[PDB]
Design a protein around this motif. Structure first.
Motif, PDB file in Angstrom:
ATOM      1  N   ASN A 252       0.976  -0.932  -0.023  1.00  0.00           N
ATOM      2  CA  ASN A 252      -0.256  -0.033   0.079  1.00  0.00           C
ATOM      3  C   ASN A 252       1.021   1.163  -0.021  1.00  0.00           C
ATOM      4  OD1 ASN A 252      -2.588   1.855   1.555  1.00  0.00           O
ATOM      5  ND2 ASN A 252      -2.530   1.202  -0.571  1.00  0.00           N
ATOM      6  N   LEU A 253       2.220   1.148  -0.020  1.00  0.00           N
ATOM      7  CA  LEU A 253       3.268   1.869   0.140  1.00  0.00           C
ATOM      8  C   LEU A 253       3.091   3.236  -1.000  1.00  0.00           C
ATOM      9  CD1 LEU A 253       4.694  -0.300   2.023  1.00  0.00           C
ATOM     10  CD2 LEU A 253       6.607  -0.274   0.653  1.00  0.00           C
ATOM     11  N   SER A 254       2.462   2.792  -2.097  1.00  0.00           N
ATOM     12  CA  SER A 254       2.479   3.765  -3.375  1.00  0.00           C
ATOM     13  C   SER A 254       1.436   4.939  -2.870  1.00  0.00           C
ATOM     14  CB  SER A 254       2.519   2.997  -4.570  1.00  0.00           C
ATOM     15  OG  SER A 254       2.969   1.712  -4.466  1.00  0.00           O
ATOM     16  N   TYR A 255       0.508   4.690  -2.397  1.00  0.00           N
ATOM     17  CA  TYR A 255      -0.591   5.370  -1.933  1.00  0.00           C
ATOM     18  C   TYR A 255      -0.351   6.216  -0.773  1.00  0.00           C
ATOM     19  CZ  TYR A 255      -2.109   2.570  -5.566  1.00  0.00           C
ATOM     20  OH  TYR A 255      -2.143   1.542  -6.493  1.00  0.00           O
ATOM     21  N   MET A 256       0.703   6.057  -0.263  1.00  0.00           N
ATOM     22  CA  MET A 256       1.087   6.588   1.287  1.00  0.00           C
ATOM     23  C   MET A 256       1.700   8.204   1.144  1.00  0.00           C
ATOM     24  SD  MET A 256       0.853   3.267   2.948  1.00  0.00           S
ATOM     25  CE  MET A 256       2.837   3.429   3.666  1.00  0.00           C
ATOM     26  N   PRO A 257       1.353   8.808   2.123  1.00  0.00           N
ATOM     27  CA  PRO A 257       1.941  10.224   2.324  1.00  0.00           C
ATOM     28  C   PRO A 257       3.238  10.335   2.650  1.00  0.00           C
ATOM     29  CG  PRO A 257       0.593   9.748   4.323  1.00  0.00           C
ATOM     30  CD  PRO A 257       0.410   8.578   3.585  1.00  0.00           C
ATOM     31  N   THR A 258       3.822  11.436   2.191  1.00  0.00           N
ATOM     32  CA  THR A 258       5.139  11.764   2.515  1.00  0.00           C
ATOM     33  C   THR A 258       5.217  12.695   3.688  1.00  0.00           C
ATOM     34  OG1 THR A 258       6.218  11.781   0.326  1.00  0.00           O
ATOM     35  CG2 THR A 258       7.312  13.188   1.778  1.00  0.00           C
ATOM     36  N   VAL A 259       5.620  12.520   4.764  1.00  0.00           N
ATOM     37  CA  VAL A 259       5.807  13.245   6.117  1.00  0.00           C
ATOM     38  C   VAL A 259       6.968  14.131   6.047  1.00  0.00           C
ATOM     39  CG1 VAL A 259       5.436  13.148   8.623  1.00  0.00           C
ATOM     40  CG2 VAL A 259       4.689  11.138   7.142  1.00  0.00           C
ATOM     41  N   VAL A 260       6.577  15.164   6.090  1.00  0.00           N
ATOM     42  CA  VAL A 260       7.686  16.366   6.131  1.00  0.00           C
ATOM     43  C   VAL A 260       7.965  17.297   7.535  1.00  0.00           C
ATOM     44  CG1 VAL A 260       8.606  18.580   4.953  1.00  0.00           C
ATOM     45  CG2 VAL A 260       7.487  16.780   3.645  1.00  0.00           C
ATOM     46  N   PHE A 261       9.134  17.185   7.550  1.00  0.00           N
ATOM     47  CA  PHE A 261       9.987  17.873   8.924  1.00  0.00           C
ATOM     48  C   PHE A 261      10.718  19.069   8.329  1.00  0.00           C
ATOM     49  CE2 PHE A 261       9.469  15.239  12.536  1.00  0.00           C
ATOM     50  CZ  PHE A 261       9.173  14.190  12.002  1.00  0.00           C
ATOM     51  N   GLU A 262      10.119  20.381   9.158  1.00  0.00           N
ATOM     52  CA  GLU A 262      10.884  21.591   8.804  1.00  0.00           C
ATOM     53  C   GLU A 262      11.752  21.804   9.745  1.00  0.00           C
ATOM     54  OE1 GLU A 262       8.210  24.964   8.544  1.00  0.00           O
ATOM     55  OE2 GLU A 262       9.903  26.414   7.919  1.00  0.00           O
ATOM     56  N   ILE A 263      13.215  21.774   9.571  1.00  0.00           N
ATOM     57  CA  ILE A 263      14.209  22.169  10.343  1.00  0.00           C
ATOM     58  C   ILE A 263      14.808  23.326  10.034  1.00  0.00           C
ATOM     59  CG2 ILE A 263      16.132  21.217  11.635  1.00  0.00           C
ATOM     60  CD1 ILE A 263      14.947  18.347  10.805  1.00  0.00           C
ATOM     61  N   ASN A 264      14.634  24.506  10.832  1.00  0.00           N
ATOM     62  CA  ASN A 264      15.394  25.835  10.486  1.00  0.00           C
ATOM     63  C   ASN A 264      15.066  26.213   8.894  1.00  0.00           C
ATOM     64  OD1 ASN A 264      19.040  26.321  10.365  1.00  0.00           O
ATOM     65  ND2 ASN A 264      17.601  27.609  11.263  1.00  0.00           N
ATOM     66  N   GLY A 265      14.031  26.395   8.698  1.00  0.00           N
ATOM     67  CA  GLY A 265      13.627  26.591   7.663  1.00  0.00           C
ATOM     68  C   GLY A 265      13.523  25.508   6.396  1.00  0.00           C
TER      69      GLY A 265
END
Length: 323
Positions: A252-265
């Motif tokens: 199901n890996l293809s339909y999953m979101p990308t989780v983003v971390f914002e570090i120091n801009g």
């Protein structure tokens, strides 16, 4: 000074450990290099527990540079609790010789956590402020005696699980793509810094308004406040297990979101394959909750994607895209 190269071996995306030598002549041990703790200890022949019986034990009676100190050292690892006695001896880490190194000698390591761990002991790499009493962290001693070319260390965690490497006193550009981004440490205990935000599709999912986070090779997972992790598990399609884990159907890996971390801009994405651990039959979430309103732990899940630099001279973290 000198540069040491310490190749890491991983015991299934969870434990990254390498080789050190203790005493004169050398006794060899496998140790977890740990950015989340500041003490050094190995199992000793006075340790009677099943776990000591299953690992390399230090024989002081064979070391000519051994010198008991007698001071007590109590530790915690996972659900585990270890008790030992401080001594002095010579540590050998690759090139580098570290002569009157404070070292825990276990006496008690009760419970399965230790028996089944793949390393013998732990070598802490956090700030001295985290060390037990009478204990001087290994890296500090190397910095005090100028044994390292530079007061920084680098961790490269091979996603592919082959070439992991620990580098003492140098940065190697052949381990990352792009440029190195330097984030200043806010609190000098753990290697702590500020996370701006955690987004899914430009939508803030967690870490609303910033949060404190720690870079911890000692931790396998990505750990955060339970309320926030719940958002993440729902949103990535993970369900609670009969073990208490969060399963994800592989594929199901293809339909999953990308989780983003914002570090120091700057942006630090984790793809579904990176945050997802797939072994044997199942797919599990690298996301783990902590009972309730804290600080995030960026464990192996994160560091597998980002070559990390730990700079004790500037109290800075450096992150680059792992190759």
């Amino acid at each position: 000074g000198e540069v040491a190269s310490v190749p890491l071996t991983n015991y299934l995306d969870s434990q990254y450990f390498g080789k050190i030598y203790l005493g004169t002549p050398p006794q060899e041990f496998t140790v977890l290099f740990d950015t989340g703790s500041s003490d050094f200890w190995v199992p000793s022949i006075y340790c009677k527990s099943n776990a000591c019986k299953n690992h390399q034990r230090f024989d002081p009676r064979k070391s000519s540079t051994f010198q008991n100190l007698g001071k007590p050292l109590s530790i915690h690892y996972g659900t585990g609790s270890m008790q030992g006695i401080l001594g002095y001896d010579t540590v050998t880490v690759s090139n580098i010789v570290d002569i009157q190194q404070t070292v825990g000698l276990s006496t008690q390591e009760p419970g399965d956590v230790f028996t089944y761990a793949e390393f013998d002991g732990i070598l802490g790499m956090a700030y001295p402020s985290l060390a037990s009493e009478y204990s001087i962290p290994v890296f500090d001693n190397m910095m005090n005696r100028h044994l390292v070319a530079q007061d920084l260390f680098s961790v490269y965690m091979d996603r592919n699980g082959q070439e992991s490497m620990l580098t003492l006193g140098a940065i190697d550009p052949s381990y990352y793509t792009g440029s190195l981004h330097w984030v200043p440490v806010t609190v000098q205990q753990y290697w702590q810094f500020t996370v701006d935000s955690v987004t899914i599709s430009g939508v803030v999912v967690a870490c609303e308004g910033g949060c404190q986070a720690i870079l911890d090779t000692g931790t396998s997972k990505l750990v955060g406040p339970s309320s926030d992790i719940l958002n993440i598990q729902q949103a990535i399609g993970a369900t609670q297990n009969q073990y208490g884990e969060f399963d994800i159907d592989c594929d199901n890996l293809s339909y999953m979101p990308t989780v983003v971390f914002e570090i120091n801009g700057k942006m630090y994405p984790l793809t579904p394959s990176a945050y997802t651990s797939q072994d044997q039959g199942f797919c599990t979430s690298g996301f783990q909750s902590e009972n309730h309103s804290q600080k995030w732990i960026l464990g192996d899940v994160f560091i597998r994607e980002y070559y990390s630099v730990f700079d004790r001279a500037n109290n800075l973290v450096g992150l680059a895209k792992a190759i």
